[PDB]
Amino acid sequence: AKESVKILQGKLDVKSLIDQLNAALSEEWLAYYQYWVGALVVEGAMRADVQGEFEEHAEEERHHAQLIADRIIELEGVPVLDPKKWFELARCKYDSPTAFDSVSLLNQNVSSERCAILRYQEIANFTNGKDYTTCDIAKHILAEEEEHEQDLQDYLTDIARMKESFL
Amino acid sequence: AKESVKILQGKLDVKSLIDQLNAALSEEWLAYYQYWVGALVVEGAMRADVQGEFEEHAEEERHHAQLIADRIIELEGVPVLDPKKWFELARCKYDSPTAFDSVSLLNQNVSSERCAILRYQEIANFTNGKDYTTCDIAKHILAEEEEHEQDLQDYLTDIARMKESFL
Amino acid sequence: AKESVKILQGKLDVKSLIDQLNAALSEEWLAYYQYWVGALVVEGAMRADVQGEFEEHAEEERHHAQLIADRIIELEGVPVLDPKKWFELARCKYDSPTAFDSVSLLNQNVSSERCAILRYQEIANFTNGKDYTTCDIAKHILAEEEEHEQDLQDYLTDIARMKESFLK
Amino acid sequence: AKESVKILQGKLDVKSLIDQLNAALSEEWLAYYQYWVGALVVEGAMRADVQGEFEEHAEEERHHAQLIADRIIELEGVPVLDPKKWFELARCKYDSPTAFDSVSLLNQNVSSERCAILRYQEIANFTNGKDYTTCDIAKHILAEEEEHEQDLQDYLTDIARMKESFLK
Amino acid sequence: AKESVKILQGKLDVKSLIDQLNAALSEEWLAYYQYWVGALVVEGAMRADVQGEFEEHAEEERHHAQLIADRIIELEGVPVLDPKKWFELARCKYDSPTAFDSVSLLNQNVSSERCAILRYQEIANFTNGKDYTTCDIAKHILAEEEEHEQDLQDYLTDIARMKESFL
Amino acid sequence: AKESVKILQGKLDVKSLIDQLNAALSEEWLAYYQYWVGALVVEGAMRADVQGEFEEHAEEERHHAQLIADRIIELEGVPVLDPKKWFELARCKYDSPTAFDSVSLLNQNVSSERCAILRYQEIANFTNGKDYTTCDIAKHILAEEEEHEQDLQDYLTDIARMKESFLK
Amino acid sequence: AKESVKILQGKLDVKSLIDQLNAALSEEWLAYYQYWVGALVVEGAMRADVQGEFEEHAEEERHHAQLIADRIIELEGVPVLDPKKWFELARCKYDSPTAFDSVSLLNQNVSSERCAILRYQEIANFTNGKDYTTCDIAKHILAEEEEHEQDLQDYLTDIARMKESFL
Amino acid sequence: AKESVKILQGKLDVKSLIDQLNAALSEEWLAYYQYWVGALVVEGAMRADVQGEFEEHAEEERHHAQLIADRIIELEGVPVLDPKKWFELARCKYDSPTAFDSVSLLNQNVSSERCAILRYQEIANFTNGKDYTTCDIAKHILAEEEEHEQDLQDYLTDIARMKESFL
Amino acid sequence: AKESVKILQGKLDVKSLIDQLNAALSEEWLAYYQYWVGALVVEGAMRADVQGEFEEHAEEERHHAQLIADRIIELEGVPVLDPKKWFELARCKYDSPTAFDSVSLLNQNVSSERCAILRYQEIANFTNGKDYTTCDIAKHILAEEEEHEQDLQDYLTDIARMKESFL
Amino acid sequence: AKESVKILQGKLDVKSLIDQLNAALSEEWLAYYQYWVGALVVEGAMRADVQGEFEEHAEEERHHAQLIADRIIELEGVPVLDPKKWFELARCKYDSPTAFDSVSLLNQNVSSERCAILRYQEIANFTNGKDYTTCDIAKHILAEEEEHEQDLQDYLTDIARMKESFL
Amino acid sequence: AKESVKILQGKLDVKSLIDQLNAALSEEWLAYYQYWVGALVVEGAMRADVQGEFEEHAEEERHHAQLIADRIIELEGVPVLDPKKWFELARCKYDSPTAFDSVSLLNQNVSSERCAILRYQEIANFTNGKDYTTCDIAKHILAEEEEHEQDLQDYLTDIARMKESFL
Amino acid sequence: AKESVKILQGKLDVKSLIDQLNAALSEEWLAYYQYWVGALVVEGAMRADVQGEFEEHAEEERHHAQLIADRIIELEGVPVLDPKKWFELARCKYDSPTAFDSVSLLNQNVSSERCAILRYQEIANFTNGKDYTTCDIAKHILAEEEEHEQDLQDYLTDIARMKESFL
Numbered sequence A, B, E, G, H, I, J, K, L: 001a002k003e004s005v006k007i008l009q010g011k012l013d014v015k016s017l018i019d020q021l022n023a024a025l026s027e028e029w030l031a032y033y034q035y036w037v038g039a040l041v042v043e044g045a046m047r048a049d050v051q052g053e054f055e056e057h058a059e060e061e062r063h064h065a066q067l068i069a070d071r072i073i074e075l076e077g078v079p080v081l082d083p084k085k086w087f088e089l090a091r092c093k094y095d096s097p098t099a100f101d102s103v104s105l106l107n108q109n110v111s112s113e114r115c116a117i118l119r120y121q122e123i124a125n126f127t128n129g130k131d132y133t134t135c136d137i138a139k140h141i142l143a144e145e146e147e148h149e150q151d152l153q154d155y156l157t158d159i160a161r162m163k164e165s166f167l
Numbered sequence C, D, F: 001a002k003e004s005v006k007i008l009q010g011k012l013d014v015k016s017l018i019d020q021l022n023a024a025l026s027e028e029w030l031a032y033y034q035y036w037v038g039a040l041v042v043e044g045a046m047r048a049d050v051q052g053e054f055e056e057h058a059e060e061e062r063h064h065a066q067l068i069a070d071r072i073i074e075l076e077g078v079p080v081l082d083p084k085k086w087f088e089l090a091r092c093k094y095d096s097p098t099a100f101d102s103v104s105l106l107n108q109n110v111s112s113e114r115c116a117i118l119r120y121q122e123i124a125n126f127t128n129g130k131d132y133t134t135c136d137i138a139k140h141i142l143a144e145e146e147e148h149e150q151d152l153q154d155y156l157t158d159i160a161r162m163k164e165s166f167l168k
């Protein structure tokens, strides 16, 4: 949106915003896949519930990706065109499943959530009072990432508590 | 409903019925909150399932409250106007969460269900063959309280059984 | 959410935020019940409409409570565990029905609303630019409380206006 | 249902039950029409709400009629085949609109309701513990008639209360 | 609708129109009940289908009644306030079930449909080009009565044809 | 639709029809806004119901506009392209809210309705037996305008009747 | 539900109630299958309608089974674990299709309905005023069995009447 | 519908009406297929939109066919029993696709719409004020044919305008 | 689909496949109309049910036609562009209604079903293991034609069985 | 479907196919009940999830039974008319619940799944390329039985993995 | 909302806010009509798509109008009561269709979107941190205006690109 | 599914099948992203339609990935756990957008479709008659890839045909 960008360029560094958004975009796709494949391999304590959350969270990150990519286009930017570039652009590094047990996978995904939380706070901070539209997108995604963290932490807490309780 | 009450006053003590209903109403609001907050804090074995039941049961007690309150109005009564009075009127005492583990919360809520079962049997007994409408309301709620008890007991049974099984 | 709270503790007093949220939570449950019982007893001018709003508003405060409680949990807090504590924590005092006429009940609920608006403006102000997520929750609830106020005021206005109109 | 009736004839006077049901059926159709035409002509205080209830109640009596008629067939009876007979069979007399104001129409329908409540209490009492199926039908209808009474009384109460309130 | 009626009074005899509509209304209620009770007692050939049509047709006549009554009100008329008057006002006489077999009931209802068809043609003729709104209502109902006739005739045709075929 | 218009030009003055439709279109947009803003400001007797009708009627006039505009396009016409022209083209004059009480607003909208009824009767008369499609559109809109009139009159009747009833 | 049963044991013989429920349960499964397979093989007069009812009734008995089994569990009982036992426990004997014509199948299913009607009247009688919850279940099922009887009898009546009519 | 036809025979030539309806019916089936196969082969400018309209219009003509055929039956007529006869009865001649480009197909279908428009105006004229029911059917179909014409003309207009614009 | 066809041309005679599909297409349109007009004129035993099936089957053949036509396009073929050609291409000959009784119409439609069955067995045989996609289409349609045959045969069986039973 | 069967009798032994289908049918009813009663009594580790699967799988086997029975009818066969015969015909023996813990019940149902898997592989092999319709039914059911096996194995895997993890 | 406004008057100039909102309201109604009539007359390149967007955007501006008007009322203001005043109050001038081609109409509407974007940024800036509720409304509308701009620009881009590509 | 795999290992090389599936899985994710980002950047002729297809096809490939991954798990395999490996495993190479015009993007996606087509023909061939379940998955995906190819080719055909037509 050329006229909108023209107006926004007066208030903040749009070019930098686009770079941050493409880093975010790369991170969303990685977090998406990480959950998706995690769902496919998770085993053990509370598996059906944890698998279910991973599936749900995969779908939520995918939607995040779309919100971000659509906004990049509105800012006259180009979203990352090649998945090979995700790894360069991402600050949050892809955390591949090795151990398939639920605690291991829950811990990996919690770290990625923390890094997601850090990204959208930055973008919200960067755009607050300047790019109202991008700011609200970041805040929306942020709220969901905090919920994701909480959801995963609850399972970790429950499994830890079960373990104690059984001794 | 003045004409209805006129007819019913010939068959039973409506004034006493209203008092019983207001004690029941008080109890429903307490049971409602108890489940609601219990859902918010429950941790441990089978948490997602137990939390889910607490949420569902919270909503079911709320609906019980409406059935009772609406009927009080039809009996030309006034429902309890102030939550401060719930504690005076209730026979079932509010059972505050202290321990957040699922067995603790399950046991507390099972106690409340037993108390609710006693209430609606009384009201059903009091109204059977006399106030058909209020009787059917009591029986309806009763059936749901018995199901609630069963639901909670099943988790207690499952967690006890897991514990054995793991040794 | 431990990592989220860790980050937020650098920007604001989360402990204080939780206390404000638990006061808000207490207030929501009281406002909820107030509307719910009000709906059950309201009589007089425009009763069906006013009763309807009370029922709708009861459900809306009920949802506010959930938004607040869920967020308390995310801030590593514990929501108020006992209704007996609502009265201590609440700044907005429960306003029990005495008169059952619609103007009386409307006026009571308008006060409760104005007090709610003040609560969420405070929380919004406290969290603005710092806890984006909690701030948006407060702003969301706030927007609804302002609508509730407007809804109730409209009935007061209409009834007052009818009264005038009928003398002539 | 021949085998079901055979069994029930050992427990109660089914022939009498059928007669009571056909009197009830007649009454439902009259109550149905009364509400339906009442809705069409009602004017004055709280008209839109009162008209709405009349329309809703018309539909609810209509459904009562079906419950009753279906059960008559199950008891090997024949439902009243001619509307001309409704008036003979009905204990509740059709209460034709004369005054179209809402209080007048509300009062007429409240009488019809009270008469309906009496009918279903009788049928419930007659069948209690004996014809479980018919009893539950009567109790179901009864619960609705009590609600109808309450709904109508509320408007009477509100209008009376408005009237007072406006003098001052 | 006072202003609408004022305009229409210049084009046709509204008072007469209202009388015709009230005769139609009376007839709809009778036809409604006739189908309703017919459905309750029908037996024999193609009973489930014939019963089903009677039920459907009952509901369709009921809706006709509402269309007519609502329009009477808009013409500043009063719809018939007492069912006792239906029999006076109706041209189509109520045709009570005596024989419960489907051919008997089908023939009775076909007669009623013929009578209904005559009514709405009259009203359509009376209002054509003058009271556009009432005319379209009459035509709408007419189309449905013609369909009702067809529906009933088809069963008569099918049962007659079965009879032949089986000899 | 060129071929359709070609055929219709043999039966009636299509150019004149289009002008009538554009006057109607202008009137719909004015009636639409009138109801829409009326809904926003109405106060007093039966306000919630009256406001509700205004909102519903606003949406119904909005749909009338679309039916008319679409048909203009089918008649190879151009709908009015500038709201500034509505006022010139409209026979029904925009009736701005001054008094916000429900009787005042009801009376204003009843006039607008009566004027709408006249418009569609004209168009129906103009097209009857000649432009079947446009005629049915006018008749459809007409039937709705008559209902709108009735709806509004009912409230006037009810409020007048309440007023009487309350003196005694 | 242990607390509920404790309360009920004071009012009636729960053990006996459970045995009656398991006999009922066995009967429901047999009635279910009987309708299900009857639907699959029915031929002749009004076949499509009769087949349709059999299909519907099969589904209704299956739901009855669930209501009964769920309540058995709530009464601290164990539902019949093995279909081989159905035949021992059932009073209503499975009535296998031999003749596939609709009258034959209708008669068989009517007899099973009669026996179903007898069962739930007994259970209703046994539990009336004592086990409100189980009583309402029995009454609910009873109402449906009476409807089933009526539905089947109507076809028998129609076919008989067709037969006459065609001579 | 025998009684309805009896009444209508007094007002117009029903036999002739039926012949006109069967010509219309034949035309609808041809127009239906023409659109259907046109959709399957269309190529070029605005293809996806034009294909979509052809698909939609095919479905609309099919519904027209049903309205007409159902009414023929109500008029005691027999609808054309054999597709071989469509070509004899149709005034609108089937216009087979030769050129598959959108302008060619749009022009062919516009001509068929014009001929459809002519048919229903005739039938409306023939039945106006006499057979209210058949008249309303013709008018309903007519309105849709005029819309079809408009829809197709719009594409022709757009493509012509694009062509200019690009030079 | 040019690349797909290129691959398929190595495995089978695509040109012949297209011809078989166009013959099938022609046959579907004829079977479609046959059922559609049959529904409009059927009379007699079990008419409502038989009419209903004809209506349902009409719709099912019409969907078959779409599956076949779409696939022809994917095989780079052209579907039959003119209904006049249906009769040349079809092996299954159009079986026009003469007698309107249900047995006559049922018998005619059964023959056409058998003919459809032969067609899709052929096409399934022709494409099995070679054109997986077209094979699955043919098998899908085949399964529905077998069901159609069964549906129709059931009515013939029922009517024959009624006839006996009534003597 | 007589004509379809006539054609199929040339390609395979239909009589044998019917016997295999009736054995499968018997097996589906047993597997259906097994899951259904298993759901009612299951206790312990992951109970809510395991109970849920048993309920879902009960419903899926019940649908399998319908697919098989319907096809038997189409092959001019008669489905097993008496549940007493299920035990004779079934290869998969009914595996009655003894121990109510989830591992025990999971193991029992896994064995029955394997047995269902064998059955549909056989029937698919028997009919492949010959009875396309029955083959696709067998393959459809097969795919679901493989999924069932996977579902159940997952829980066994999770519970085994929890056990380890807790020591 | 008197108490709300009382509070807000301490934080900002509400009177000025209301004037800005009424200017915005005026502008929304003009933008609404502009799109609405534009949709009615648009011709040429990508017409169906562009027409569709105009229709969608018309509906979106209408909704904007309601959000604004409702908020004016809550701020104890009066929304503009007469459309004649829209032109005085609006900063964005109504841009009447002259040329009906899609590029012309797209350019006109893009201008209007730019003007709308300026308005809601102003209102957002004016209310940020002070009137949270009105601010969020402005931001919400802003986000949609930026999307509208993007949507329109994409068509301009596509049509320009087509033009090049075709030479 | 251990028992299922045991049976399948007798009929084919499951280990090889898993490798082929993981290559397919990798390919689906790449084709998914390719379409997704292509939708985001496409410009020019028929953009809205082409963009829409890319969006739809993105979603369809994403579902393909799930079908394949789920089946890998059932074959006791592990799906590719890291997106970095997609590029190694994929035969179909990721075809990054360079030119954003619709013809360029359409051509790129057509090539990838052909490559998907080859893959599922291979897997269908590999598993035909041996792994019925995996074969049907491959055939299902295959049918969709053929449709995708057709969809894309249609646009190329239309745009080429427009170009000619405009000169």
Ligand SMILES: [Fe+3]
Pocket (backbone or CB within 6 Å): A028, A031, A060, A061, A064, A116, A141, A145
């Ligand atoms: Fe994310």
Ligand SMILES: [Fe+3]
Pocket (backbone or CB within 6 Å): A031, A057, A061, A113, A116, A144, A145, A148
């Ligand atoms: Fe996340």
Ligand SMILES: [Fe+3]
Pocket (backbone or CB within 6 Å): B028, B031, B060, B061, B064, B116, B141, B145
């Ligand atoms: Fe409760």
Ligand SMILES: [Fe+3]
Pocket (backbone or CB within 6 Å): B031, B057, B061, B113, B116, B144, B145, B148
């Ligand atoms: Fe409870």
Ligand SMILES: [Fe+3]
Pocket (backbone or CB within 6 Å): C028, C031, C060, C061, C064, C116, C141, C145
């Ligand atoms: Fe609140």
Ligand SMILES: [Fe+3]
Pocket (backbone or CB within 6 Å): C031, C057, C061, C113, C116, C144, C145, C148
């Ligand atoms: Fe509030």
Ligand SMILES: [Fe+3]
Pocket (backbone or CB within 6 Å): D028, D031, D060, D061, D064, D116, D141, D145
């Ligand atoms: Fe009643």
Ligand SMILES: [Fe+3]
Pocket (backbone or CB within 6 Å): D031, D057, D061, D113, D116, D144, D145, D148
């Ligand atoms: Fe009543």
Ligand SMILES: [Fe+3]
Pocket (backbone or CB within 6 Å): E028, E031, E060, E061, E064, E116, E141, E145
């Ligand atoms: Fe009628």
Ligand SMILES: [Fe+3]
Pocket (backbone or CB within 6 Å): E031, E057, E061, E113, E116, E144, E145, E148
């Ligand atoms: Fe009729």
Ligand SMILES: [Fe+3]
Pocket (backbone or CB within 6 Å): F028, F031, F060, F061, F064, F116, F141, F145
């Ligand atoms: Fe209008």
Ligand SMILES: [Fe+3]
Pocket (backbone or CB within 6 Å): F031, F057, F061, F113, F116, F144, F145, F148
């Ligand atoms: Fe109007």
Ligand SMILES: [Fe+3]
Pocket (backbone or CB within 6 Å): G028, G031, G060, G061, G064, G116, G141, G145
């Ligand atoms: Fe049963």
Ligand SMILES: [Fe+3]
Pocket (backbone or CB within 6 Å): G031, G057, G061, G113, G116, G144, G145, G148
């Ligand atoms: Fe039964």
Ligand SMILES: [Fe+3]
Pocket (backbone or CB within 6 Å): H028, H031, H060, H061, H064, H116, H141, H145
């Ligand atoms: Fe047509």
Ligand SMILES: [Fe+3]
Pocket (backbone or CB within 6 Å): H031, H057, H061, H113, H116, H144, H145, H148
């Ligand atoms: Fe057409």
